[PDB]
């Protein structure tokens, strides 16, 4: 009805290709699947044949060392759902040492219930950025896509599709050049969708044949029976593998088949939770009544012996192996090898273990910051022990700084010392707390107190700043007087400090960092006392290197000698954000004075060199400056102010055309104190029209050939006049120009032309200011007499 094939048992295929024929005689594979060591295939072996069966695989997939496999569709063009009941090293799909995969072939698998994909050792792989991992992966368990060709270029993750942006890729999503991605709503992505891209029923999984119908699907989410996806089945039928239902005959048949053991792994079948399980979970005694898990009568502990008498866990697969067990015989090793966080899954799969008769090694943690996987271990028999007599081993651990609660969980270690070495992230506080609870009462163990607590905050006492005084240059701190019970352990304090713009400073881990690094530690000398006050009752430190108006996050720790005591592990002061006072507004930067007109000057300036406090206002001062006067001894022939708050540009208005000006720009953060004045100067452009001779040249003629000239200075001289270009011009003669100096002009109210000749003359005069040249005045006429 929903699966076009039989239900085959899990298969393992190595070398021979003949067994692959069985993949075409059934479309359901209960168990896992592995195809490896396929050293006899060629490209013509994966392109002239294709298996049209295989819809769902209950546990996982494992393709390794496959020769000439270039696409996933070449083998199964219809695989839709991987249930993920079991994993393979925290994975539900693995690609390893593949040297012939150049493109994918799966387009109907949209959800992985448990696990992840392990793509590794591929150097011809294409199309791995168009797979929409977010859409497919709805669970993430250390998903690592490494050793591929998409960090280099083979094809360039491009194909000729919906092209949706959901992983951060703006390129077309596809699986082959002749195929495109299939999208469905996320609201309908955890229950699977149809092949039209629309929502599907919630009792179906993966691909569907009728949108929003449980009567016709290709997989079921709860159970498959009657060829329709249902939520439960009658109990004359028992759920097997949790994807279907089957009558009691199959269950009793399996039980009888294992009655006489000839199968290495089979367990006599029984039924609990209306399922024909292999063995009842702990708490239910395996006694047939009709192959039903009857209630336990008295203590029924399940002694689950472990291989090697020790078991290391770095994957959830090994953890689920021992689920449903109460008593454990043997030891274990905790080793978090990279990956994502697993503590929640660890407690989910091992939180049912209440007794261990061995020791427990811990090494290289990378996901445990707090131990929370055992909330039932109350009795540690310790019948097996490490040579050294340690029932606990803590080595090379740099991620753990916490331990299980001690008011709801107990642990009484009956034998063996507690090993704790080279664990600086783990604090001695919890170490001694457990030394006291376990007792192996109270007994001193061989634990190095100089190797644990060096890169973590393990203080247990506490300080509190009693007297604090803040100033722009001196910050004094005075915390509560504290000395350990042994008054010879105090070796000083640790004034931790660092620059903070705003309070975002989280307390440091507890290691020692100095130089230019964050949270600069500063050792403080011991007070040299008996903890009795001699002249002080508040110990602290007055740091004085501070600059005006700057906030620093500062806390203080304590260094004391170690001892075998529970206490005397140092103290810790609270964190404070001490903002210093502002007393300088700072010098302004880059003043730019530029004249844009003859009466308009634009000023500029940059924010102060150091921002101290809120700038209450900007202070400016300027006044009219005069030019230098030298034309009377040589010859070439308060103050206006404006206050602008939070402004970086100002314009001066009211100035006269020409003459220098001086401006001073100061920053102020009060209203008052200001910074040192900054000097800049510019002059407005001179008006050449204002320098033009006004009124006509009058000619006081006297017959000495003395034609005295009466001309007038410009309407508004620019500064003063250098000289006058009195260019008289006699027609029918060579042109002339006379340099009438300023002194001569003042002395004679102009000039007095002498040495002339009689006749019609025409004089043009051009007055020249200090800067800027005017225009020639009209050519006044005069008839010089003799």
């Amino acid at each position: 009805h929903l699966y076009p094939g039989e239900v085959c048992p899990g298969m393992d295929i190595r070398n021979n290709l003949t067994r692959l024929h069985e993949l075409e005689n059934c479309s359901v594979i209960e168990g896992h699947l592995q195809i490896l060591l396929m050293f006899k295939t060629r490209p013509e072996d994966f392109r002239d044949l294709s298996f049209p069966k295989l819809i769902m695989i209950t546990d996982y997939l494992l393709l390794f060392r496959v020769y000439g496999l270039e696409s996933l569709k070449d083998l199964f063009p219809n695989l839709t759902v991987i249930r993920g009941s079991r994993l393979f090293f925290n994975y539900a799909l693995v690609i390893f040492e593949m040297v012939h995969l150049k493109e994918l072939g799966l387009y109907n698998l949209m959800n992985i219930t448990r696990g992840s994909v392990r793509i590794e050792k591929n150097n011809e792989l294409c199309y791995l950025a168009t797979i929409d991992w977010s859409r497919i992966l709805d669970s993430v368990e250390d998903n690592y896509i490494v050793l591929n060709k998409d960090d280099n270029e083979e094809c360039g993750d491009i194909c000729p599709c919906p092209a949706t942006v959901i992983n951060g890729q703006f390129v077309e999503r596809c699986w082959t050049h002749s195929h495109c991605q299939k999208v469905c709503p996320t609201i309908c992505k955890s229950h699977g969708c149809t092949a039209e891209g629309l929502c599907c029923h919630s009792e179906c999984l993966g691909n569907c044949s009728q949108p929003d119908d449980p009567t016709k699907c290709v997989a079921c989410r709860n159970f498959y029976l009657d060829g329709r996806c249902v939520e439960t089945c009658p109990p004359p039928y028992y759920h097997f593998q949790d994807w279907r239902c089957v009558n009691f005959s199959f269950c009793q048949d399996l039980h009888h088949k294992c009655k006489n053991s000839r199968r290495q792994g089979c367990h006599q079948y029984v039924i609990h939770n209306n399922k024909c399980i292999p063995e009842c979970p702990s708490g239910y005694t395996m006694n047939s009544s009709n192959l039903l898990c009857t209630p336990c009568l008295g203590p029924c502990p399940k002694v689950c012996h472990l291989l090697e008498g020790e078991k290391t866990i770095d994957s959830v697969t090994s953890a689920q192996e021992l689920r449903g067990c109460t008593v454990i015989n043997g030891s274990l090793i905790i080793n978090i090898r990279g990956g994502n966080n697993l503590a929640a899954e660890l407690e989910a799969n091992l939180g049912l273990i209440e007794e261990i008769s061995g020791y427990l090694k811990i090494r290289r943690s990378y996901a445990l910051v707090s131990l929370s996987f055992f909330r039932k271990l109350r009795l540690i028999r310790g019948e097996t022990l490490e040579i050294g007599n340690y029932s606990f081993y803590a080595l090379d651990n740099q991620n753990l700084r916490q331990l299980w609660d001690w008011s709801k969980h107990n642990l009484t270690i009956t034998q063996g010392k507690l090993f704790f070495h080279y664990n600086p992230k783990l604090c001695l506080s919890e170490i001694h707390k457990m030394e006291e609870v376990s007792g192996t009462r109270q007994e001193r163990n061989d634990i190095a107190l100089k190797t644990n607590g060096d890169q973590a905050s393990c203080e247990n006492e506490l300080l509190k700043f009693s007297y604090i005084r803040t100033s722009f240059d001196k910050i004094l701190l005075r915390w509560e007087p504290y000395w350990p019970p042994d008054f010879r352990d105090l070796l000083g304090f640790m004034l931790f400090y660092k620059e903070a713009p705003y309070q975002n400073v989280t307390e440091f881990d507890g290691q020692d960092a100095c130089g230019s690094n964050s949270w600069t530690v500063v050792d403080i000398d011991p007070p040299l006392r008996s903890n009795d006050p001699k002249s002080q009752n508040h110990p602290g430190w007055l740091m004085r290197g501070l600059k005006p108006w700057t906030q620093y996050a500062i806390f203080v720790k304590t260094l004391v000698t170690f001892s075998d005591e529970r206490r005397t592990y140092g103290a810790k002061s609270d964190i404070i954000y001490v903002q210093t006072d502002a007393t300088n507004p700072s010098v302004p930067l880059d003043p730019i004075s530029v004249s844009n007109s003859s009466s308009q000057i634009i000023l500029k300036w940059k924010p102060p060199s150091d921002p101290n406090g809120n700038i209450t206002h900007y202070l400016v001062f300027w006044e009219r400056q005069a030019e230098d006067s030298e034309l009377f001894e040589l010859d070439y022939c308060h103050r206006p102010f404006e206050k602008v708050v939070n402004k970086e540009s100002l314009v001066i208005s009211g100035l006269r055309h020409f003459t220098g000006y001086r401006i001073e720009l100061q920053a102020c953060n009060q209203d008052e104190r200001c910074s040192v004045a900054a000097y800049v100067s510019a002059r407005t452009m001179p008006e050449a029209k204002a320098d033009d001779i006004v009124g006509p040249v009058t000619h006081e003629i006297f017959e000495n050939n003395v034609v005295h000239l009466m001309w007038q200075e410009p309407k508004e001289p620019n500064g003063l006049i250098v000289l006058y270009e009195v260019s008289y011009r006699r027609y029918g003669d060579e042109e002339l120009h006379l340099c009438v100096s300023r002194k001569h002009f003042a002395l004679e109210r102009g000039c007095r032309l002498r040495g002339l000749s009689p006749g019609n003359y025409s004089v043009r005069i051009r007055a020249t200011s200090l800067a800027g040249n005017g225009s020639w005045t009209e050519p006044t006429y005069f008839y010089v007499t003799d």
Binding site: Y467, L476, R544
Partner: peptide, 23 residues
Amino acid sequence: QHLCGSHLVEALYLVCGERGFFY
């Protein structure tokens, strides 16, 4: 840091808060 003359006087005034200034 180094405290001398006026700087030392200022520091002694500011740092102490339980007794008057002596120097």
